[PDB]
Scaffold this active site. Structure first.
Site, PDB file in Angstrom:
ATOM      1  CB  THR A 146      -0.827  -0.030   1.172  1.00  0.00           C
ATOM      2  OG1 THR A 146      -0.057  -0.296   2.391  1.00  0.00           O
ATOM      3  CG2 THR A 146      -1.994  -1.293   1.119  1.00  0.00           C
ATOM      4  CG  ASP A 151       2.647  -3.143  -4.718  1.00  0.00           C
ATOM      5  OD1 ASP A 151       1.766  -4.180  -4.997  1.00  0.00           O
ATOM      6  OD2 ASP A 151       3.519  -3.301  -3.827  1.00  0.00           O
TER       7      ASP A 151
END
Lengths: 305, 307
Positions: free
Chosen positions: B29, B261
């Protein structure tokens, strides 16, 4: 002709374990023979086994599966390879192998090999896997490559499956060199995407097709398991044929799915069927095989061809 | 003046080659949030990170770096007794990378257990865009996980769009079935879903290329992005787009970390700036390629591509 190796297979669940036989090239040969009545050439297996009782049991079972044993050499001192399958409480399968000095490894080392080579030189169609190349020693590997080239010279068509198991190969690079070598002598290649990517690294489908075709392969079949299969034809056709969807409930232990697809596609393809139709046939055979226990599932539960 | 918040956890990262070891920070994240802020002009979009950290020096180092990365830390709670999660990366002789984790009692796990959580929920409920991954759900305890799901629905009700990436690490979940149910619950509240095929298949089993879309669309996701690594990306919604990844020679592959990501971040940066799904997929592919052609999870700002 299917060049390869079978092994004595031990399946242990809990404290109860049973004996049988298994191998990738044998799975393809048996499944091909099951759905095939007859064709230009029907000779199937080119392994080497021992003179022991287990080899004879295997040979009788293979003859009952309409597989000729004419070219199976028998070595008194050698004995067949043996592997064990273990299933945990969750159902996961773990495989252990003892095949370093298996009889099938020395099939090209036999005194009679030259004779068989000439006989195999005139054969119509030959099928081998990466395992078959792997077990052979480098000198024996060169002999096999020369026989394949001579078979090309006499009009034969070579079929190669890229079953990649790193353990059998000394190194990744040795595997790459041998795979390039055989694919240079190869006319039709069955490529499982997982094995291809594991061997060469992840690449787009186009670079894979380019790499294999630059060697000289005519027809390329890419197997993607539950995902759509990809066929590049002898002519130049490019088609994507979906696998039959199966609900999660019916998915059962099956170690022969890819080999069964190779056989089922080939059984239809060599019986005048179209490439799309052959892929469909392979998909149904693979699904039925994955819904039943064992590498070789019973003939009764097999798909009607 | 658009506010986007990335919920998750960052960890202390140790990279060891032989006897030589280095210190840093990393997380899925956080990697996505950093790349998002990098590719997002400050006025156009405001990237924030929602986590919990300690009062320690490592937490301060992370916060200073994130402020230097133009990420606001307004909602980052600090726990005195707690300490950040820590993981170690090992490099094989051939170059294979192995990961070891120590995050069972990390500070970020308790971010929704704090007294401020409810308050923060209200603050985040009105946010424009919210981003979370499956790992973010995994670390959270079930009650806090339910709280997060409720917050996602509140954000949707007030016009916000929720983005979910299916980063699947089974260890954090007690069981496979727990993972499946939690994934479904969040997917109900998801507006844009990034699904890595490997993680999807590992969690749910091998399924046809279409059945994944069937399950996700039946859940209620509007836009579905499927990442396949070196294979063509696939964007769904009945519209179907297939956008190829940029081809790379084997020599240029040096580090496959943060690839997905970075793809999520680049796709989102192009997508939320009025760009089309196809254009966003191309942008994500370019950013991911740059990330994989350089070592490290977070590549230096110098090597980033011109937008």
């Amino acid at each position: 002709a299917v060049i390869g190796e079978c092994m004595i297979e031990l399946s242990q669940q809990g404290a109860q374990l049973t004996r049988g036989f298994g191998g990738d090239t044998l799975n393809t040969a048996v499944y091909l023979a099951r759905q095939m009545p007859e064709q230009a050439l029907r000779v199937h297996y080119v392994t080497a086994l021992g003179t022991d009782s287990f080899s004879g049991d295997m040979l009788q079972a293979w003859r009952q599966e309409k597989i000729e044993t004419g070219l199976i050499q028998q070595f008194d001192n050698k004995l067949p390879g043996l592997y064990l399958i273990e299933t945990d409480a969750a159902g996961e399968r773990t495989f252990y192998y003892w095949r370093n000095d298996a009889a099938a490894r020395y099939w090209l080392a036999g005194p009679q090999a030259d004779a068989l080579c000439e006989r195999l030189a005139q054969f119509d169609y030959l099928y081998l896997s990466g395992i078959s190349l792997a077990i052979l020693a480098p000198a024996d590997r060169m002999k096999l490559l020369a026989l394949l080239r001579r078979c090309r010279a006499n009009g034969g068509k070579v079929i190669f499956d890229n079953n990649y198991r790193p353990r059998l190969w000394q190194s990744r690079e040795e595997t790459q060199q041998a795979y390039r070598e055989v694919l240079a002598c190869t006319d039709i290649a069955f490529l499982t995407l997982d094995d291809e990517e594991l061997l060469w690294g992840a690449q787009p489908i186009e670079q894979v097709v380019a790499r294999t075709q630059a060697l000289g392969v005519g027809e390329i079949v890419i197997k993607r398991g539950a995902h759509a299969c990809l066929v590049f034809s002898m002519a130049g056709e490019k088609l994507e044929v979906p696998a039959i969807a199966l609900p999660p409930e019916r998915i059962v232990d099956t170690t022969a799915a890819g080999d069964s697809f190779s056989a089922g596609y080939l059984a239809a393809r060599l019986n005048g069927g179209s490439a799309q139709w052959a892929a469909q046939r392979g998909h149904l055979l693979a699904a039925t095989v994955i819904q039943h226990r064992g590498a070789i599932i019973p003939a009764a539960m097999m798909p009607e061809a």
